[PDB]
């Protein structure tokens, strides 16, 4: 064994030498990517205000306003409030939340409006008001009325108008970053098809089986129940194409990871999965053999279809399959799942939400919680695009640590290890603020610090290898 541990550890010295050549390489390729001229041209990012208006002319204000009461215009999303005989309009966007309190014969309703200082949950990027230190804001207005029923109806209608506005803004955002795609060109002959397929994410709240068709510039999923629930995916927009057979699964999978996100029903997604499920002493052993036949049948058919998709792409799309033997267990989201390496990506496709990490997009891997006799560790992927959030994989068993380190080395990904869960929300924002200064001071190559740098030890006893008495 001693000569094998010497051999294995010399291969581990080559592993460390590769890791050192990877840190030096990335340090050189961070100093070359960011120049001092880009640092001088620093871009200050400012909160964008979505401009809105209630009315342009006094004629636009409805004639129903004549009542000296709260009048709501759903068409213009406006809440006209009687302030000292003034028909003051308040857009539903400016409105925040409302509280109704029937005190005595009067119904006191306090309508709150957006005000800076831990206000709405909306991110800084989009502000419901224009930025202004010298701007004063109407924070709340309280009204009373003798008529309780109408005042309750008015409050319901304000709340409904806000819900409809928020829903429309979410629907817009789920279609916003989605790039306007070209139209799918139908195949003029009999298209190749895969029947009885489920799609994820589903276009409707009802799970329905559909048919997947191959066309000239993409694939089309089409539900038999409704023609309007078509999902078109262009070959140009597929980044990665995965197939996964039933090696342990109750299901077979064809997964399309996209370059640009698509709007399927109400959800924006980078991932579109097509799947089917197998699920429905010698007799029980024979029933397992019949399930193994049904697995092999669906595996063969879906693999063939995924190869036929790759062929139809004219060499734009390679068909990837997971290496199950190189798989490790971890928690990227909220469940423990088997993470599977492929040729070019780290994937999890069985449970939603899906994980697809492209290995080429990784800048550095950090192993958190790694120290003296630890039960488990976490793995963090940092991307070359610093605007992209870091990906965490939690609770990877410590038994898999040396395997994960080897695998990262075999893929040319630099890694570092730490006893503490470093915050990346902090690390990234500092790196985004000045990427050049970051690499100037040592980037991640200095942070690695592979050198043990330990010479203190614990002294030594009188060195005497001689029999005493």
């Amino acid at each position: 064994r001693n000569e094998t541990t010497n051999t294995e550890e010399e291969k581990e010295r080559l592993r460390k030498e590769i890791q050192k050549q990877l840190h030096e390489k990335i340090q050189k390729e961070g100093l070359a990517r960011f120049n001092k001229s880009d640092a001088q041209d620093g871009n200050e990012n400012h909160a964008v205000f979505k401009r809105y208006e209630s009315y342009v002319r006094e004629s636009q204000i409805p004639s129903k306003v004549k009542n000296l009461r709260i009048s709501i215009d759903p068409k213009a999303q406006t809440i006209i409030l009687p302030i000292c005989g003034r028909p003051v309009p308040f857009h539903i966007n400016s409105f925040k939340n409302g509280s109704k309190n029937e005190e005595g014969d009067y119904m006191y309703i306090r309508l709150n409006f957006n005000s800076p200082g831990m206000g709405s949950s909306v991110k800084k990027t989009e502000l419901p008001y224009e930025d202004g230190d010298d701007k004063e804001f109407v924070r709340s207005l309280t009204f009373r009325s003798t008529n309780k029923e109408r005042m309750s109806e008015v409050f319901k209608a304000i709340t409904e108008l806000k819900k409809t506005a928020v829903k429309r803004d979410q629907e817009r955002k789920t279609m916003e970053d989605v790039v306007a795609q070209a139209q799918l060109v139908e195949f003029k002959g009999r298209p190749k098809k895969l029947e009885n397929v489920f799609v994820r994410p589903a276009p409707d709240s009802k799970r329905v089986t559909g048919t997947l068709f191959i066309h000239q510039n993409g694939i089309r999923y089409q539900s038999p129940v409704r023609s309007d629930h078509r999902v078109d995916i262009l070959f140009s927009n597929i980044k990665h194409l995965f197939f996964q057979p039933c090696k342990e699964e109750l299901m077979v999978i064809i997964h399309c990871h996209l370059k640009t996100p698509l709007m399927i029903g109400k959800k924006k997604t980078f991932d579109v999965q097509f799947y089917r499920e197998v699920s429905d002493d010698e007799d029980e052993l024979e029933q397992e053999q019949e399930e193994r036949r049904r697995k092999a049948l669906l595996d063969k058919e879906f693999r063939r279809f995924a190869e036929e998709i790759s062929e139809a792409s004219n060499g734009l799309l390679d068909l990837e399959t997971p290496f199950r033997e190189l798989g490790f267990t971890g928690v990227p989201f909220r469940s423990s799942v088997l993470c599977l390496p492929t040729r070019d990506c780290l994937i999890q496709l069985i449970d939603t939400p899906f994980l697809v990490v492209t290995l080429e997009e990784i800048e550095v891997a950090h192993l958190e919680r790694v120290q003296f006799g630890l039960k488990n560790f976490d793995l963090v992927f940092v991307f070359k695009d610093f605007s992209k959030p870091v990906v965490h994989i939690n609770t990877i068993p410590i038994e898999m640590l040396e395997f994960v380190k080897q695998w990262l080395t075999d893929v040319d990904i630099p890694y570092s290890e730490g006893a503490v869960n470093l915050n990346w929300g902090t690390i990234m924002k500092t790196i985004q603020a000045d990427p050049y200064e970051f690499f100037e001071n040592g980037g991640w190559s200095f942070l690695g610090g592979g050198e043990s740098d330990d010479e203190e030890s614990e002294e030594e006893e009188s060195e005497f290898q001689v029999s005493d008495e």
Partner: protein
């Protein structure tokens, strides 16, 4: 060792003050106690982290400690 050496000494003496009054301690007794205590607590925090991850969380809460001590067989 993460805990210091004098607050821990005072804690140990305070606890020992119940079983026999005015007891002396020895060179490597407090050190061994601190090593054992820290090893024990680190193992307990490992189990607590495992439970917290099991619950799909990242924050350890007292009920995770209680579950860990229940499964270990601790009273």
């Amino acid at each position: 060792l993460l805990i210091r050496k004098l607050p821990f000494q005072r804690l140990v003496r305070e606890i020992a003050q119940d079983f026999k009054t005015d007891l002396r301690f020895q060179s490597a007794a407090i050190g061994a106690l601190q090593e054992a205590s820290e090893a024990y607590l680190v193992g307990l925090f490992e189990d607590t982290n495992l439970c917290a991850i099991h619950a799909k969380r990242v924050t350890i809460m007292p009920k995770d400690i209680q579950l860990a001590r229940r499964i270990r067989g601790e009273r």
